[PDB]
Every structure is written in structure tokens, then in C-alpha cells.
Amino acid sequence: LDNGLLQTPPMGWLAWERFRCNINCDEDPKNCISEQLFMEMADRMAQDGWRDMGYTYLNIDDCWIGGRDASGRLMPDPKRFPHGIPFLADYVHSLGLKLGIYADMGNFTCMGYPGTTLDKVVQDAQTFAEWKVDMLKLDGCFSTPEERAQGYPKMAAALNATGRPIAFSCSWPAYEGGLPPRVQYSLLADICNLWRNYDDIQDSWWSVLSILNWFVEHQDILQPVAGPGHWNDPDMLLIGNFGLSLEQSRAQMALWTVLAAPLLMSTDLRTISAQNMDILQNPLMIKINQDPLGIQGRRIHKEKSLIEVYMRPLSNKASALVFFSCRTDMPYRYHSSLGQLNFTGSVIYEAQDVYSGDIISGLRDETNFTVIINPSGVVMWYLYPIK
Amino acid sequence: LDNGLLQTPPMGWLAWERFRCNINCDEDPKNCISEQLFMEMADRMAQDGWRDMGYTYLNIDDCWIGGRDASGRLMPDPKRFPHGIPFLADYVHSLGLKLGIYADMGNFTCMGYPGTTLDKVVQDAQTFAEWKVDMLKLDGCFSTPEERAQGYPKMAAALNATGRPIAFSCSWPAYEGGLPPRVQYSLLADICNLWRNYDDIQDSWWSVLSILNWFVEHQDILQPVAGPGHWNDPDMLLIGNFGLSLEQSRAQMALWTVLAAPLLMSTDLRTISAQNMDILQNPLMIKINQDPLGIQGRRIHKEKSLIEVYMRPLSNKASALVFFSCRTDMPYRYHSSLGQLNFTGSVIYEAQDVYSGDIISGLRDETNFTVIINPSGVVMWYLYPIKNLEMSQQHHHHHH
Ligand SMILES: *[C@@H]1O[C@H](CO)[C@@H](O[C@@H]2O[C@H](CO)[C@@H](O[C@@H]3O[C@H](CO[C@H]4O[C@H](CO)[C@@H](O)[C@H](O)[C@@H]4O)[C@@H](O)[C@H](O[C@H]4O[C@H](CO)[C@@H](O)[C@H](O)[C@@H]4O)[C@@H]3O)[C@H](O)[C@H]2NC(C)=O)[C@H](O)[C@H]1NC(C)=O
Ligand SMILES: *[C@@H]1O[C@H](CO)[C@@H](O[C@@H]2O[C@H](CO)[C@@H](O[C@@H]3O[C@H](CO[C@H]4O[C@H](CO)[C@@H](O)[C@H](O)[C@@H]4O)[C@@H](O)[C@H](O[C@H]4O[C@H](CO)[C@@H](O)[C@H](O)[C@@H]4O)[C@@H]3O)[C@H](O)[C@H]2NC(C)=O)[C@H](O)[C@H]1NC(C)=O
Ligand SMILES: *[C@@H]1O[C@H](CO)[C@@H](O[C@@H]2O[C@H](CO)[C@@H](O[C@@H]3O[C@H](CO)[C@@H](O)[C@H](O)[C@@H]3O)[C@H](O)[C@H]2NC(C)=O)[C@H](O)[C@H]1NC(C)=O
Ligand SMILES: *[C@@H]1O[C@H](CO[C@@H]2O[C@@H](C)[C@@H](O)[C@@H](O)[C@@H]2O)[C@@H](O[C@@H]2O[C@H](CO)[C@@H](O)[C@H](O)[C@H]2NC(C)=O)[C@H](O)[C@H]1NC(C)=O
Ligand SMILES: *[C@@H]1O[C@H](CO)[C@@H](O)[C@H](O)[C@H]1NC(C)=O
Ligand SMILES: *[C@@H]1O[C@H](CO)[C@@H](O)[C@H](O)[C@H]1NC(C)=O
Ligand SMILES: CC(=O)N[C@H]1CN[C@H](CO)[C@H](O)[C@@H]1O
Ligand SMILES: CC(=O)N[C@H]1CN[C@H](CO)[C@H](O)[C@@H]1O
């Protein structure tokens, strides 16, 4: 979407995966969807390095809505958002952050809150702009395909007409199977800054693998459509939650990075472990994710050993490689060379291991190397030519 | 098997899951299958609390064999076991541990090492006893169903005839589909101390779930067969390795305990984290696993919320309860009561949370309670009539 926004993938925090539709503030005040939750997360992002590392969006998901007023104007739940959304936008802005919100193209939100029907699209866009929102995720429950086909373009146009830059995240393709012929990716790129292609992530390794598999199965279609201002979105990071092991957490970060995915966390920033912070705040990893060329990577090799190799092209003749073990036994010594991974001949390279920080220098295409990859884990290199 | 052994489930360490068939000692001396590996693991078991908490077996799996000598006697790989197996058994015994070994009822071991064919069953049994081995796992690759039907009883008879008590772990049912009519559990209970019912565990939560699902699906058949001296074996613990999260690691420990499973670790004890050691060395957890009645537990409740409840009967009218969340979203507040979990009579109970150590007092059947269960995780209670506390302090003694 040609609105000047998200020339690199969005980084931030999104409520949904970890906090879901918990509205029981009487019994669970610390974890319910509420103004307090968002203010506390904003504070952590400001104070604990997140904003400084690039994590700038703080996004509200489903279950914020209270109703519509006599003029049809959307309102937040007054018990859980007592000061209203402008208050929260202003608070987040005072901390150098951006506020995202959520609506549904359809009669109701997925969890049954008031929907943004076709006849409400313009009003709702105007309300969000008036509130000084910075991003909108438009879900697609409780609509027909024809309604979504009218609605998503209508919302892009309505947001534009407000004059406020609002990043636009579109769930449209996920409701239509994610693929041609029903999904038109050139159309999506013209109307959306990012789109959810596929199924919601859940807090499990199986879920991560299911998403990775669908993305890699369809990478010939998906890889070319991503670029500055228009990203594929394989969903939220699980890092900091319950379902991923340490190796798996590091793997998701590396693989989302090579896929030029949004880095939208969804975890309790108030209690996040040092180990998990270190993954998410890895400076080179973020540099790679945020590479200005915005070229989504691909799986380039799959071996009978169950080692997979992904490659992302980067600025300044650099590349990212992710060596990914789908083995479930023990560490594996993977033997390769840059020549076996299709690199340019006669060039000499240097590599930095993104997780260890160690430097491997003087690699020619013919140079044999070994990387040790743990099960359901990765080794990631940032590689560039040297003199 | 009525050989006086494994009146409670075996606890120990088995090389296979973590170290597999790594024989490259030239490139990987610290992690290859070798006498050094076993000696270092024994030292850790003796020094770091494992033995003292009940982990007594240290078991060799596949890939130890060098060949057979001119008389047909098994030899370990001389480059990897330069001192021989008797030396290793002696070393392990000197630390108060027991040594397990591995063979295959078939032409070769699964990784292609010399097989214990029917003609070698007796000789190999005699060799193992002479080496002062304490446990034998008998795998089933490269055999026919008739060879297994002959061989597993033949090995049980051969071990018996050596006069040395050797705990006998039989893979037979895993090669027959794990179920009647092909598997005859009444025979297995008479010839084996434990048996691998089902597929090999791998270092993933999906694997743990697949095994749990199978045991729960078939628990009407499987639960009654387990007891002192004859256990079901759902395979090794994954705690300490790569695939399980913290919540999953605690779940596996709890569920294996409720199932009266062996607690056979397979992890690098030299680098295991304090957090994972704390799960595996939990004294109440181990007490429950080792309960002298040896009654395997069952899943007693499954709810549309994806919370499941398992219960294991214990000594002195105590019970273990595991509340298990198969949810994949966020912590869940599970509301229940003992009455809803088929506790009847007007007994007043107390519970200890096995992981937190917290005590919950004054539970009657009607008492509403809430437990907070994390996704792919558990809450586990040791539950007892409160009158047990008093009665346990009011026993009276006299000299004989
Ligand atoms: C509502 O919708 C409109 C229409 O889509 C948006 O207006 C567009 O905004 C974008 C982003 O600001 C503009 O794109 C930029 O144009 C710059 C100059 O282009 C001039 O020349 C072209 C022809 O060559 C004319 O069409 C145009 O009128 C301009 O006069 C470029 O310099 C920018 O380049 C950027 O990208 C390149 C590579 O991608 C980088 O090398 C640069 O560094 C730089 O980052 C960019 O292309 C676009 O021109 C606008 N179109 C129109 C018709 O006005 C509104 O932004 C939007 N409003 C809201 C609130 O959402
Ligand atoms: C080869 O195979 C034979 C079976 O064919 C095995 O022989 C059995 O060995 C076990 C273990 O040693 C024996 O079990 C023990 O019996 C002891 C004596 O009980 C006798 O007396 C009672 C009468 O009171 C009879 O009912 C009974 O049949 C016996 O004749 C018990 O004292 C032992 O108790 C153990 O367990 C209790 C807990 O339950 C503990 O408190 C005790 O401390 C103790 O550990 C035990 O039950 C069994 O009797 C033998 N059976 C037969 C038929 O002889 C061989 O062991 C096996 N050899 C090898 C090398 O594997
Ligand atoms: C989104 O909401 C609209 C408007 O509420 C839905 O349309 C309405 O749907 C109801 C029933 O769900 C319709 O009632 C039906 O009327 C016919 C008349 O013959 C009757 O035979 C049926 O038994 C039933 O009562 C109602 O007419 C209709 N109203 C309007 C104004 O269209 C729509 O179904 C919802 N869309 C989605 C995608 O969920
Ligand atoms: C287990 O082995 C026997 C014997 O196999 C022979 O010796 C081996 C070392 C190897 O070199 C084999 O190729 C030899 O055939 C197998 O029984 C034989 O089966 C073959 C059919 O493949 C048949 O021609 C012979 O008649 C059989 N020989 C005898 C002595 O019965 C047996 O099938 C193997 N079992 C399994 C489960 O693989
Ligand atoms: C790389 O390894 C291959 C196979 O292991 C070997 O044949 C070759 O000599 C090695 N190449 C170099 C340049 O050392
Ligand atoms: C337990 O909770 C239910 C509501 O969920 C209530 O109706 C019932 O009376 C409670 N029982 C007791 C003993 O407090
Ligand atoms: C594809 C898509 O937008 N899925 C969404 C489906 N609906 C929930 C909230 O109800 C989340 O927003 C989830 O991310
Ligand atoms: C059921 C069974 O014994 N499976 C075994 C299959 N064979 C390997 C060694 O090769 C392991 O021992 C594994 O535990």
C-alpha cells in the first residue's frame, strides 16, 4: 500500500496470542484486556529497550469494543477502557510508540463484538483517525466473500481519505484460503501494508511448523509479492510464552526474520525471561529483518538428513542463511560449502553467527564448513563478501 | 516377572534418546557411545543426587558391540570400550549403581550390530550374567513374529537359569502392535519386568502427546496389567533435552508418574540445568512414582475446555491428581470439586501441590476449588484424607 508506511516490516506487540479475549477484570485484573494492560505494556516497551530496538507498535486486538453510540460511533468498553482510546493513543505517543487497533469487516468481530459492516467502514475509519490510531488490523469474520471484496478496498480508501497515515493489516486472504485463484496478491499489495495469509498461530511448535510448511510449499507465489510497504504476515511471535522450547524460540525468530515477517510479539513483557529478551532484542537479527531491500527469503535446500537451508538476500551484497534442523534426535553436524548453496564464485566471504556472535572468515565457495544444529533448532549466519 | 526385581518402576538413565548411535569418537569424543560416556554419567549419578533420589540404573543401548569372538561370545567395541564390560560393571557397582545392557532378538540390532539369534540366546544370557549386568533390554528388529514368540520366553528362561537376577525389558509388544489378540499381556507379565508397548519417543511434544493418546485410548486394556514386577513402558523421559518447553517437561514427569512408568532419563547429566534437575529430583514426585501398590493411573475426565484429569490410586487411601491442559492459548482457571472427580463418601482431604509444595486444607467432596493450568502444562496434587496425618503419628511399637 503506497502510503509511505512500513517500508520495513512492522515491529511491536499485539495482545491477542497471549491475552486473547479475557475480559474478566473482576477476577483477573492484571491480565484482562483493558486500558491498564496496554499502559503497562507501553511502559515496558519504553523502559526495557523494546522501543529503542525498533519495537514501536502497541496493538489492541479483539474484545475492546463496548458498543456504538446514538450516532453509530464505535466506543470501547467503558469499564475496561475508562478514559477512552484517545487517552491511550496520547499516552502511547508520549512514550514514542504507535497505537494499533482492531476492527472486523463483517457483522461482528470473531468474538462477537460490534462489527464494521460496509455501511460503517467510512465512519469507523474517521473515528480511528480522530482518535490518532497508527495501525488497523481488519479481521474478516461474519462476512461473505463479496462483502470482503468490497470492504477491504473501501477501508483502504477511507483510511487514506482521513489524511492520517494508518498502517493497514488485512486478514482478507486468510478467510479465502490464502491462494490463487481466489486470492489476488497484486490487489492485496495495492490496498494493504500487510496481510494474514494463513491460520492463526497457537502456542505450540506444531503450529509454527504448520505455518512454516504452508509458507514454504507456496513460496513461489508468496516470496515475490513481499516488499517495502506490502508484507506477508505468518502471525505473531510466540517467544516468551509456554509452548516453545529455547531452540524452537530461537528458530521462530530466525525463520520469521528470513521470511521478512512482521516481528509482532505477544507475550507478558512484565515477566519475560532474560533468555527470551535476548532472542527478541538481538541487534543483528533485527538489522536483517529490517533490511531496506525488503526481499523475502526462501528455503533453498532440503536434505534427507532433515536439515533445511533458508537464504535471504540483503543490502550491500550480504545474505542471511538459516540452517534449520527438523530432526528430533540430537545435535547434527551439518557439512556444506557456500558453493553447494549456490553462492557467487571467486568471492571470499565472512560470516557472523547471529546467535553466538562468532566470526567465520575467509570462506570461498569451495571451503568446507560444519555447523552444529540442535533438534528443532537453527544456526543462523549473516554473510558478506570481504577483501 | 517373578524374579524379585522392580517391585517399583525402574529409575535410571538410558543412553539412546540423547546419544543415539554416535560412534564417531575421533570427531566427537565427549558424546560418542563409549566407556568414558558411561563412566562420566555414573559419576554424575553418584555425585549429583540422582542415585540418592532413587535413580539407580545406568543403561547401555544399541551400538556397543564390537563383534563375536571365535567362540561366539559378544565383545564390546575395543576402541570405545577398551577396558571391557566387566570393568564397567565393576565401576558402576562401586558407586552403588546398576548396569543395564542391550541386545536384539533377531539377526542384527536395529542399527546393524550383531544380533542375538535364537542360537545365541543362552550364550548371550550367560555372558551378561558373567559380566555382572543387572538389566537387559531385548529389542526386536530383524526377527519374524515366530522368532519373537520363541525368543522372548527363551531369553527369560535363559536369564533365570544363570542364577543372577537380571531385570528384563521386553520390546516384543512394540513389534506386534501393542494390543490383543497379537499381544498376550498375561504372558508378558510372567516373562518380563517391563515392556515397550508402543512407538519410540522422539524429542518433541507431538511425540509425547502421541504416546499419551495411545495409552489413554487403550487404558482399559493396559492399566490392569501393570503392577509390582511388571510394568508398561511408554519410553524415556525427554527432560533436559531440546524439544520440550518447561511446562511440557513438568507435564511429562507428572504424567509418566501417574502412569506408573519407568523414570528412565536420557539426557546429558554433565550439563543439565538446575531447573530440569529440580523436576527430575522432586522427592514427592518420586515417592508417588515409586508407590508400593504399583497401581497404574487412568485419565478420569476430559472436558470440552481441553483440560484432562488423571488420577492414580496410592498407598493409605491417598491419590495423585494431574490436571493437564491441552490448550494452546494461555493459562486456564479450571474450576472443579472432588465430588465431580468421582470421590465419594464424606472424607475430608488435604492436598499438596507437587511442584509448588503448597498445601490446600479442608477439601470435602462438595468444596469448589480452582487450579490455574498453563498451556501444554499441568498442576499435580498429592491428595490424602486429613485423618491420615493423625493416624500416621499414632502407630505403636514394641521389640520382638
Ligand atoms: C493516500 O494515497 C495516496 C496515493 O496512493 C498517497 O500518496 C502517495 O504517497 C507516496 C508515499 O509518500 C508517494 O510516493 C513517493 O513519491 C516520491 C516522489 O514521486 C514524485 O514523482 C512521481 C513520479 O515519479 C509522481 O507520481 C509523484 O506525484 C511525485 O511527485 C518518491 O520520491 C518516493 O520514493 C520513495 O521510494 C523509493 C523507492 O520505493 C525510494 O528510493 C525513496 O527513498 C523513497 O522512499 C515515493 O515513491 C506517492 O507519490 C503518492 N502518490 C500520490 C498520487 O500523491 C498518500 O500518501 C496517501 N495518504 C494517506 C494519509 O494514507
Ligand atoms: C527364576 O524363576 C523363579 C520362579 O519360577 C524365581 O523364584 C521366585 O523368586 C522370588 C524372588 O526371590 C520369590 O519371591 C520371594 O518369596 C519369598 C518367600 O516366600 C515363600 O513363602 C511364602 C509363604 O509365606 C509362599 O507363599 C511363597 O510362595 C514362597 O514360597 C518372599 O519372602 C519374598 O518377599 C519379597 O517381597 C516382599 C514384598 O512383597 C518384601 O517385603 C520382602 O522383603 C521380599 O523382597 C519374595 O516374594 C519366589 O518365591 C520365587 N518363586 C518360586 C516359585 O520359587 C527366581 O527368582 C528366578 N531366578 C532368577 C535368577 O531370575
Ligand atoms: C448480517 O446481518 C444482516 C442484518 O441483520 C443479516 O440479514 C438478516 O438476517 C436475518 C436472519 O439471520 C433475516 O431474517 C430472515 O427473513 C426471512 C424473510 O423471508 C425469513 O424467511 C427467515 O426465516 C429469516 O427470519 C433478515 O431478513 C436479514 N435482514 C436484512 C436487513 O438483510 C445477515 O444474514 C448477516 N450476514 C452475515 C454474513 O452473517
Ligand atoms: C535372518 O537371517 C536368515 C538367514 O539369512 C542368511 O544369512 C544372513 C547372514 C544374510 O547373509 C542373508 O542374506 C542370508 O539369507 C534369513 O533366512 C533366510 O531368508 C532367505 C530369504 O531372504 C532365504 O533364502 C533363506 O532360505 C533363509 N535362510 C535360512 C537359513 O533359513 C531370515 O529371513 C532373516 N530374518 C529376517 C527377519 O530378516
Ligand atoms: C570437502 O569435502 C569433500 C567430501 O567430504 C572432499 O572430497 C573435499 O576434498 C573437500 N574439499 C576441500 C576444498 O577441502
Ligand atoms: C460451587 O459452585 C457452584 C457455581 O459454579 C455453586 O452453584 C455451588 O453452590 C458451589 N458449591 C459450594 C459447596 O460452594
Ligand atoms: C486471520 C486473522 O485475522 N485471525 C484473527 C481471528 N480473530 C482473532 C480475534 O478474535 C485474532 O484477531 C486472529 O488473529
Ligand atoms: C521398541 C524398542 O525397543 N525400540 C528401540 C528401537 N531400537 C533403538 C536402538 O537401535 C532403541 O533401542 C529403541 O528404544
Candidates A27, A244, A330; nearest CB to B20: A330
| Shared-domain flag, residues B42 and B147 | yes
Q: What is the C-alpha to C-alpha distance for residues B339 and B341, in angstroms, rounded to an integer?
A: 5
Q: What is the C-alpha to C-alpha distance for residues A34 and A140, in angstroms, rounded to an integer?
A: 23
Active site residues of A: 139, 200
Domain endpoint, select from A290, A306, A336: A290
3-class state of residue A173 by DSSP: helix
Task: Compute how many other C-beta atoms are within 10 angstroms of the C-beta atom of residue B315.
Answer: 14
| Shared-domain flag, residues A342 and A262 | no
Strand A368-373 relative to strand A332-337, pairing? antiparallel
Write out the three cell numbers for B38. Answer: 558411561
| Shared-domain flag, residues B263 and B315 | no
Domain endpoint, select from B270, B295, B320: B295
| Shared-domain flag, residues A220 and A106 | yes
Task: Count structural domains, chain B.
Answer: 2
Side-chain half-sphere of B200: how many Cα atoms within 13 Å? 14
The helix or strand, by DSSP H or E, that contains position A371, with its residue range, turns out to be strand A368-373
| Shared-domain flag, residues A161 and A28 | yes
In degrees, rounded to 5, the angle at the alpha carbon of residue A372 between the alpha carbons of residues A369 and A375 is 145
Would you say A282 and A253 are in contact if contact means Cβ atoms under 8 Å apart?
yes
Would you say B137 and B171 are in contact if contact means Cβ atoms under 8 Å apart?
yes
All residues at 6 or more sequence positions from A34 whose CB lies less than 8 Å from its CB, including other chains? A25, A80, A81
Do the chains contact at A207 and B18, CB–CB below 8 Å? no
All residues at 6 or more sequence positions from B42 whose CB lies less than 8 Å from its CB, including other chains? B58, B91, B92, B95, B97
The helix or strand, by DSSP H or E, that contains position B246, with its residue range, turns out to be helix B246-258
Do the chains contact at B376 and A243, CB–CB below 8 Å? yes
Would you say A138 and A103 are in contact if contact means Cβ atoms under 8 Å apart?
yes
Structural domain harbouring B348: 296-400
Q: What is the C-alpha to C-alpha distance for residues B258 and A146, in angstroms, rounded to an integer?
A: 53
Q: Is A174 in the pocket of ligand 7 (CB under 6 A)?
A: yes
Task: Compute how many other C-beta atoms are within 10 angstroms of the C-beta atom of residue B390.
Answer: 9
Q: What is the C-alpha to C-alpha distance for residues A81 and A39, in angstroms, rounded to an integer?
A: 11
| Shared-domain flag, residues A281 and A261 | yes
| Shared-domain flag, residues A13 and A126 | yes
Q: What is the C-alpha to C-alpha distance for residues A33 and A333, in angstroms, rounded to an integer?
A: 46
Helix A35-47 vs helix A85-94: angle between axes, to the nearest 10 degrees? 10
Candidates A18, A245, A331; nearest CB to B243: A245
DSSP string, A211-280: HHHHHHHTHHHHGGG-BTTBEEE-----TTSSS--HHHHHHHHHHHHHTT--EEE-S-TTT--HHHHHHH
| Shared-domain flag, residues A161 and A216 | yes
Check which CATH number belongs to the domain holding A316 and give it: 2.60.40.1180
Nearest Cα residue in chain A from B247: A242
- From the list A244, A182, A259, the residue with the least C-alpha distance to B376 is A244
All residues at 6 or more sequence positions from B244 whose CB lies less than 8 Å from its CB, including other chains? A245, B203, B204, B205, B208, B238, B252
- B200 is a catalytic site residue: yes
Q: What is the C-alpha to C-alpha distance for residues A196 and A183, in angstroms, rounded to an integer?
A: 12
Q: What is the C-alpha to C-alpha distance for residues A33 and A116, in angstroms, rounded to an integer?
A: 20
Q: What is the C-alpha to C-alpha distance for residues B384 and B400, in angstroms, rounded to an integer?
A: 32
Residues in chain B: 400
Write out the three cell numbers for A310. Answer: 533458508
Q: What is the C-alpha to C-alpha distance for residues A96 and A56, in angstroms, rounded to an integer?
A: 8
**Resolution limit, Å:** 1.4
Resolved by: X-ray
In one-letter notation, the amino acid at residue A75 is: M
Bridge partners of residue B292, in order along the sequence: none
Place of cell 490383543: B180
Side-chain half-sphere of A140: how many Cα atoms within 13 Å? 25
Q: How far is CA A257 from the centre of its chain?
A: 9
Task: Provide, for chain A, the percentages of residues in helix, strand and coil under a 3-state DSSP scheme, each rounded to the nearest 5.
Answer: 35, 25, 45
Domain endpoint, select from A290, A319, A340: A290
Please report which ligand is nearest the Cα atom of A142.
Answer: 3
Bridge partners of residue A352, in order along the sequence: A359, A382
Q: Which of A241, A271, A326, A329 to mutate to test the interface with B (most CBs of B within 10 A)?
A: A329
| Shared-domain flag, residues A330 and A190 | no
Would you say B260 and B233 are in contact if contact means Cβ atoms under 8 Å apart?
no
Nearest Cα residue in chain B from A250: B242
Nearest Cα residue in chain B from A328: B203
Do the chains contact at B20 and A245, CB–CB below 8 Å? no
First to last CA, chain B: 33
Task: Compute how many other C-beta atoms are within 10 angstroms of the C-beta atom of residue A90.
Answer: 14
Q: Positive or negative, the Cα torsion across B140, B146, B152, B158? A: negative
- From the list A246, A252, A199, A189, the residue with the least C-alpha distance to A222 is A189
| Shared-domain flag, residues B360 and B387 | yes
| Shared-domain flag, residues A151 and A277 | yes
Distance (Å) from CA B33 to ligand 5 centroid: 27
Place of cell 527430575: B280
Q: What is the C-alpha to C-alpha distance for residues B371 and B335, in angstroms, rounded to an integer?
A: 7
| Shared-domain flag, residues A15 and A75 | yes
Would you say B309 and B299 are in contact if contact means Cβ atoms under 8 Å apart?
yes
Do the chains contact at A241 and B207, CB–CB below 8 Å? no
Would you say B200 and B238 are in contact if contact means Cβ atoms under 8 Å apart?
no
Nearest CA to CA, how far is A133 from chain B (Å)?
27
Q: Which of A18, A62, A330 to mutate to test the interface with B (most CBs of B within 10 A)?
A: A330
Would you say A85 and A103 are in contact if contact means Cβ atoms under 8 Å apart?
no
C-alpha dist (Å) from residue B45 to B42, B93, B95: 5, 12, 9
DSSP string, A351-368: EEETTT--EEEEE-TT-E
